[PDB]
Design a protein around this ligand. Structure first.
Ligand SMILES: C[C@@H]1CCCN(C[C@H]2Cc3cc(O)cc(O)c3C(=O)O2)C1
Ligand SMILES: C[C@@H]1CCCN(C[C@H]2Cc3cc(O)cc(O)c3C(=O)O2)C1
Ligand SMILES: N[C@@H](CCCC[NH3+])C(=O)O
Ligand SMILES: N[C@@H](CCCC[NH3+])C(=O)O
Lengths: 487, 485
């Protein structure tokens, strides 16, 4: 029980090897899985056995029970579904070892191949009746019980233990790929095209973050890891790919939070001849149909304050509330910020309302980062009953967004927030090389615009944050398999 | 013409802004795309006009030709398809400006917005009849008129995708291949996942890894060379059918068939053996080739686009050869075990020099066998893909020992024109038989909880698209490959 269980099971493998019994066989020819076994023999008669249809099935023993040395009860799991094993001495093929020698050797956690027939016990339990039982691979360690996990960080370290004990985690991850599959098929329906852009570049462009640094030995270059796929995707639209998208990982060297991770899955599409309204119409259709594709209703339950407090209802019914960033800030505080924002009359007009409201000052106090913290404390945690948009950002905050059609100083940028956390960022791209801020971003992108970029609108998604709200999870390490951990 | 055209056009759009014309308008809503335009109005009569059905279309001009200053001819390209522009003077709206100036400004490469009606040309071409054309995005640089076989096509792919209609046909099939692969595995109950690309140790293959540093934890991490270890750990977790189409990073040479980062897919099939992996690859490759072309045989310019092309027959089954057996037969020598013994190493050292082959340093057991297989097995059959099977355990640290032949494993490698596009074997699920479980301890411990008998397979997506798109270099199937400044 302490640590000696790892020793005798290890010697048990050696005792089987010396006696001539190979403990890890090569191939077991199973003819039926467990989920299909459940679907095929679900409505059998209580006590009915199908003796003429023998089946070969595999699985992992999760409960070892006995009753008289000649009747042994097991729990065989596989692909998230569970059936019972009713090993009876009279049904055992008395030609491959003794019954006791064939069943006293296996314990909890062992992968075993079963040769038997389907049937239901008198208690009404669908079970497989093995005439032959062969150990495929033994579990040398002591597996914890049901509620002996999902507490410590052993899940984030050894996820294979968390996937075999808690039905939640398996449901968290089958819904994660269900989202990615729904998102991939959603774009393909609109004629989008999936591509692959490089991840090791000589410049860190696309967003605002802190990059990584690696080195190529055969070339002697110190390359930067990407933070987004903004620049290469636009170059492909110049190449004729009007509808293009890409799903993949992006790297960030920021602080690790419950919504922040060193690496996470990104998704950016770029729609040619699409304006500001085409994006919000695309966003409201995507999130609404997604939660309806999963839960059958636009209203979902989500414990915002951990599993210890009551949840809050998140309504995904379009249209979502649109909010202007500069217009809402100057109303809740009645501090009129006149453009230009990078002046000196207004840059401290908002400094005297961030330290006056007991909020951390962001250094450097640039007009772009001041409006960011002002929006993060006055607009973000506004509508938790339903997601909302923060639209019409200033041009100081979005150096890659096209000028607004009428309103000066602003742009057509939009950010969707769920429970106050950004999960979407979209704007109409700035296809003017002369009205650009950075070309006076690498030259590979500045030269790409000089060849002609159509009026394009882009959008980025946070899939790792989306799965958090769509699975009632509060941490970023719950929605990814192997999060970065400290030894 | 040099940069003067780019600098004259840069001033040309500057004057257009001063005159009061926006060269980059915000929105111009189009009603129908160019591919939809062809699929609808193709069955018209030569010269038939539909002057009542007006449409809003967009595209990029790739051809400018004058003809009597009354009819202007253009080639509008959009989404890999082309249409003609019949700018008849009688149909032009003269209120929007001078008909001469409204079309003398349109150069090659400009993105324009056309408002007009469909129909066929006088000669019989499907054309669009613009009532008015408005420039939305101007191409300042001169588009290369086709003298494109240089090196700039790798650094500036957007130029290579507009001028060469052939390269767009190859990158569209690379997506169709991945779309076929994902659906192939998903239709077989496989469950796609995502393993972290930044691991504490690089494992799963045999290559030098890239190493970066995190600024919050202040320890150096290794970029993955293969998703092998994190995937089979999910097999221990209950996912009996798991795969991951993604990217890996290997820090080594850059040749026509090697890139510092490439796309690879690896699926792990529980309760499947070596015979199940051979049947899968034979089925997957034959169905993929037939899905793209309609036949199992294809043509491929192995020696280059100028030399004669060879044919590849993807009709299953494919030949299988044991690596240790065929090497002994072609060189008439016997390589007794152990393969890393001084006597066997010496024989492998000499045989490659009797036939004048370079020595792959370091002269080890695996390196000598790997070189002995590339210059004696992979270059003998090119008409069909073939499997090189039953590798020694010294060449495969993670492959299960052969169930019948001692000293070997149940490995299989598929080759096309002598290049490895696939690798598979039954996974070694015995934690004691691993020489290295005494790699990382975080993976050997996962085997201690019981790994069922499974069989994994790896695919080289970038190499597979090469032989299916008739490309000699791997940089031709990658959008933006690694390029030196
Ligand atoms: C491209 C998308 C657009 C939608 C918004 N997200 C936000 C992104 C920010 C972030 C920073 C970080 O260092 C670590 C993170 O895990 C995250 C994260 O998960 O989310 C970005
Ligand atoms: C997992 C797959 C399947 C099994 C075989 N291939 C081989 C892989 C090796 C490689 C190294 C490199 O530095 C660069 C490369 O492009 C490649 C490549 O394209 O192919 C690996
Ligand atoms: N790349 C942006 C999202 C897309 C913006 C519009 N092209 C980001 O990382 O937030
Ligand atoms: N990781 C292997 C492919 C899978 C081999 C079977 N586990 C490679 O890079 O070649």
């Amino acid at each position: 029980d302490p640590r000696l269980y790892f020793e005798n099971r290890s010697k048990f493998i050696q005792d089987q090897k010396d006696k001539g019994i190979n403990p890890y066989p090569h191939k077991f020819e199973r003819t039926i899985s467990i989920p299909e076994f459940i679907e095929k023999y679900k409505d059998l008669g209580n006590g009915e056995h199908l003796e003429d249809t023998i089946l070969n099935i595999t699985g992992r023993i999760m409960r070892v029970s006995a009753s008289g040395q000649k009747l042994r009860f097991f729990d065989l799991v596989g692909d998230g579904e569970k059936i019972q094993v009713l090993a009876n001495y009279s049904f055992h093929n008395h030609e491959k070892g003794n019954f006791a020698e064939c069943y006293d050797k296996i314990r909890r956690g062992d992968i075993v191949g079963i040769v038997g027939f389907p049937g239901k016990s008198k208690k009404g339990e669908l079970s497989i009746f093995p005439k032959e039982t062969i150990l495929l691979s033994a579990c040398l360690h002591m597996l914890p019980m049901k509620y002996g996990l999902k507490d410590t960080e052993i899940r984030y370290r050894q996820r294979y233990l968390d996937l075999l004990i808690n039905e939640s985690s398996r449901h968290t991850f089958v819904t994660r790929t269900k989202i990615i599959n729904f998102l991939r098929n959603f774009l393909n329906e609109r004629g989008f095209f999936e591509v692959e852009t490089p991840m090791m570049n000589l410049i860190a462009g696309g967003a605002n973050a802190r990059p990584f640094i690696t080195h190529h030995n055969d070339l002697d270059l110190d390359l930067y890891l990407r933070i987004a796929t903004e620049l290469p995707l636009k170059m492909l639209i110049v190449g004729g790919i009007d509808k293009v998208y890409e799903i993949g990982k992006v790297f960030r060297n920021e602080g690790i939070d419950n919504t922040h991770n060193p690496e996470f899955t990104s998704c950016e599409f770029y729609w040619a001849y699409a304006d500001y309204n085409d994006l919000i119409k695309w966003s409201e259709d995507f999130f609404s149909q997604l939660v309806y594709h999963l839960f059958g209703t636009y209203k979902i339950s989500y414990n915002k304050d951990g599993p210890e407090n009551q949840p809050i209802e998140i309504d995904f019914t379009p249209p979502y509330p649109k909010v202007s960033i500069v217009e809402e800030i100057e109303k809740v505080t009645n501090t009129i910020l006149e453009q230009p924002f990078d002046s000196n009359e207004t840059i401290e007009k908002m400094i005297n309302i961030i330290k006056e409201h007991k909020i951390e000052l962001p250094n450097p106090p640039t007009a772009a980062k001041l409006l960011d913290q002002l929006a993060s404390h006055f607009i973000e945690n506004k509508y938790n009953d339903k997601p909302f948009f923060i639209v019409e950002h200033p041009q100081i905050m979005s150096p890659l967004a096209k000028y607004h059609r009428t309103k000066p100083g602003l742009t057509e940028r939009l950010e969707m927030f769920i429970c106050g956390k950004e999960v979407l960022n979209a704007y109409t791209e700035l296809n003017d090389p002369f009205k650009q801020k950075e070309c006076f971003l690498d030259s590979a992108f500045c030269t790409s615009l000089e060849y002609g970029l159509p009026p394009t609108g882009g959008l980025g998604l946070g899939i790792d944050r989306i799965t958090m709200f769509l699975t009632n999870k509060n941490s970023i390490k719950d929605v990814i398999l192997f999060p970065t951990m400290r030894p």
